[PDB]
Design a protein around this nucleic acid. Sequence first.
RNA 1: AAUUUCUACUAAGUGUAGAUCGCAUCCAGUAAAGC
DNA 2: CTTTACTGGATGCGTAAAGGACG
DNA 3: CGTCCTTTATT
Length: 1223
Amino acid sequence: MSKLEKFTNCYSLSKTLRFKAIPVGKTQENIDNKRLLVEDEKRAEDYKGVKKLLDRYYLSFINDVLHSIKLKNLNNYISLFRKKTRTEKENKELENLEINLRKEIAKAFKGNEGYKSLFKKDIIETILPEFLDDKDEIALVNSFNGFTTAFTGFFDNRENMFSEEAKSTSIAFRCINENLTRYISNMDIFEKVDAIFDKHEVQEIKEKILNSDYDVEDFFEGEFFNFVLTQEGIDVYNAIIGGFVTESGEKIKGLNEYINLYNQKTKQKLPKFKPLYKQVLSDRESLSFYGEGYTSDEEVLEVFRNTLNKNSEIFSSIKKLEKLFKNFDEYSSAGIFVKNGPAISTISKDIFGEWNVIRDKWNAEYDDIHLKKKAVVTEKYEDDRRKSFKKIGSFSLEQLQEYADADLSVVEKLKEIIIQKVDEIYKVYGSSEKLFDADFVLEKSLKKNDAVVAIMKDLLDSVKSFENYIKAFFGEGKETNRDESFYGDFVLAYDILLKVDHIYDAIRNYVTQKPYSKDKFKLYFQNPQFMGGWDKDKETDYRATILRYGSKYYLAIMDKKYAKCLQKIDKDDVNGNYEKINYKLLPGPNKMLPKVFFSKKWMAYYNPSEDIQKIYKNGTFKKGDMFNLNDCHKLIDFFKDSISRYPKWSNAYDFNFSETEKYKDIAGFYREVEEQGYKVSFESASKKEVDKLVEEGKLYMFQIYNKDFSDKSHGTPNLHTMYFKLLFDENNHGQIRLSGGAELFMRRASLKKEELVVHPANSPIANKNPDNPKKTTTLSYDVYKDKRFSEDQYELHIPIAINKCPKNIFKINTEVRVLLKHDDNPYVIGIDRGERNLLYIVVVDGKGNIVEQYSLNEIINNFNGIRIKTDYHSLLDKKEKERFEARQNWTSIENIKELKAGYISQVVHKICELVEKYDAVIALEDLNSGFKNSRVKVEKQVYQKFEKMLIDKLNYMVDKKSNPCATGGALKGYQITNKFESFKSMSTQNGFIFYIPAWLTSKIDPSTGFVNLLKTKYTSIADSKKFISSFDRIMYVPEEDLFEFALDYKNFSRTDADYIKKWKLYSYGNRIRIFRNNNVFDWEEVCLTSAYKELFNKYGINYQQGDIRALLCEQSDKAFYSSFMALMSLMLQMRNSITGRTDVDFLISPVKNSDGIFYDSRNYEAQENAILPKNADANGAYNIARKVLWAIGQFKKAEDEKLDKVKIAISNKEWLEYAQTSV
RNA sequence: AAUUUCUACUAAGUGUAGAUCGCAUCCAGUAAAGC
DNA sequence: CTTTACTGGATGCGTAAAGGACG
DNA sequence: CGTCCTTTATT
Ligand SMILES: [Li+]
Ligand SMILES: [Li+]
Ligand SMILES: [Li+]
């Protein structure tokens, strides 16, 4: 109640409502007969074409400056960029260059005298008719002579490219903010990593790529940046890091690939280079050579038959390649060699049926020489054999034959395998023989034809495996004796079998591309600015306006021939009438007031004093050093008077302006003009005459519609349906505004009506919810799946503006802090991410007490005593593998983003219900860019989506049950998050949302606050002795069958964070440890007390004998100390989880609380209403909430002027003192 | 298994509950197969 | 390195009346 | 000379 009511009418945001439009009467008939849709359909294809040529001219104009630009003082900026210590005044110096570098580039585009005419009608009527050289491209631009204003929104998309500000679409942004920092950051890495590069390695990149035209060290110089400003230069720059592939097909390595190889052999971490992003609008042709994909279905076939049939050389290559293996014995068994790699364990199996025998046979050879009888199997001898067994490049056929135990002979069993593999290829041809015939004609498009592709995929994979098998027989020699009589034939065939590798590529890239589909196309009705705005004065100009016949709204469109048809209509007293809109709007007071009252047309009529004309030009009314109060007043009084003399403004609106002596800035005056400048009203217009204007075809008319508008619906409306009703409701005092810019699309059907999945009428359908007690619905009418796509649909996109005039103006992050300082029992919601639970909620009160905790793997809703629980976590898993296995098999890739978004809508609702009920703030994890990456297949892309749709919902929060006119309803929705502009603008707090660090959120004891600040990984014998002696005591407690480890953290290093210091550890409980190598489980449950006893017996230790600290240090053997750490590590292994297993994810603590009992999360997961976390996941969210409860505690001390100075970001040291004092 | 549209439904009969910012442009990211 | 897919973040607009060109 | 398309103006 109390907190939420304050946040209404806070800021201005826009949304868009969408509606199926349905033609009224003869409207569609006259539309078809006048071919209006086909002209817009043909236009929307031509409009994408004219835009392509327009990009051609922009890119040319773009590169005229970027080729010849040289940046002033680029070096001087770069030095400041890599400064190790910048001061806050020195900090300000770097910006002004960076601001001027964008200014230097941005003005260089504008500096051309042809800049301004790139975004006016001249570019289509004049400039592009000159630049273009095609006779057809010249004609597609003439057809658009009428329509240049239809490009206005496209010209806006192009002036952003020439912006000077830090805007993501600006070219100046790309070159300086993005390319430079990446280039300069690479500049620092090269100096650090110059060491590893061989002089030939430097030259090989120079030889292959740079052509010795410049050296590699040249690029990382400051003054060579001007090369990479263009896309053409970047491709060369990105090549140094990435490399490229020549025409000759050699994979040249790049500096980033070399850094990895050094790091993989020496196990160090040197950073890799960042490639540079492309430049705006570049038509970038890649440098690496590739064979172009097939244009059409017919090509793919004609390649597939000709290249793969029996006659084709590729099959002939198999037909000869087998002959060599059948003739294998004839050639020297020392002249043929099997290459060495990891793929040779498979080879050992294909002969004698076992993988590791070829490895194990050779390991007996390397051992006997290099195994002196003392060792027998030291780690070095076992490990060194791994070094030798991959260094070997190949194996002689005779060297393999020696390994095998008789009778088996490699060459005879090699002759066995290959006949089998050529036959399996022969078998796929048997199934696929129909594809090859000259006659055969395809039933369905290749992408719609899963049956024909699986046939191609089967023949291609059967040919791919035989080749991929044979490739290992090359041996990369480089070999002393090669039975070159054999290999010469072998190379002749295999190089021709290598031709499939391009075909497997190109075909995969054709078959797997999404099928052709017809996008919806905007309707214009022969007007470039059709339906731009709703103002009644413009109704003739735009030619579309809204009508109302009770509970149904229509969209009327007046044909070009009859622009003023609806204006001559008057009320009919007796017969039926429509309600016709009388929309009136005054957009942009700051722009519209000077435009009209300083215009040439009215500059004479209003004679503004000589003072005025200088006041506006000198900008004395604007706030700043220029601002004068009385000067601004003179503009306000001038604008006030001239509006009163203005007829179409004064009459249309009812204007109340507070005394000019009361305004503090010109913004205050424009705001009232903006606020009082909008009026929506209706008039009466005869139904019989309007309907006559439809049948005549002078007026087209569609009904605005969604399913809530049906006369068969008795259910709660869609949230957007409410907004639409409110726009014209008389109780909407400007909260929601009908804005201009609507569009009307035509989406032709994409499915056939008869073919759809139909549940036949009067035949019982089965219900899928196992809780629904009615398992059958017998309907008297058909249910077509996706019926909305089986017929042509009209689309109407109506933008609205919510709170265009914000009354309540204050800082939201501050007002949240003010009310948390004064809430006696404030509530906090805790939301925790995971891979075992997608989202987990924990709700706590002002004292840290748990009221609610449940996982959100499954969404539960009840309606009218009907429960339904949907396992959205299962749906995301099955749909994920329905794309993985779809990607492998070339099949269709299912969409999952809708599913994820559909999941969030149920979650987004549940938090808002929780926020409404408990009046609770929200607590999320502080994640920067890095944490998005995950080791295993990730749904945490759901988490990033969870934020967006949550923040968006809180931006205007509505409950569809509250009365719209009441607070929290449709007209007065809550706004409890700062307006969403970008993810990068965010701070630690966003209104009710707090992004809090996750350190020590999970691996902490909720019962006591205990944490593992110990490092236990094994370093040496000596450190373990210093380890043990630090403890206050190590003892055996026999009456409890536990070991007790009392310690003071102050004796250990890097333990400053903990508050209590004095902790007594225990071996209580069981832990989980992962193996390092059949067996039932890949993990085991170690019993701690039953393992300390174990360890203390192996080295003859009297653990019973009082304190054991001196006793354990007595030992002199490494195996005792290296094993002790594992026992030590498990005691502190608070969180025990196992991958992929439902049962295991529990938190167990080694400390006794105030009542002497350990925290086992399992002793809670059984409870329904637990008072502590049930699992390591809920423990996270619980602490995430408490981290904020600490932040609320900070707010309780400070004073209302200074809450902005309160920092919500917890220090690691304050949090431990709080988790241990709270209990 | 209907939907402005998405998700889950059939919810008592052409639908139910929740959510839904469109349009255009620039850019990037992930997965997969081949090399 | 490439190619295909699907997916998402950051920008602009969400306008009437002046302006001009045109038959 | 009225009509339809193009430009414009910045709290
Ligand atoms: Li509804
Ligand atoms: Li995926
Ligand atoms: Li179904």
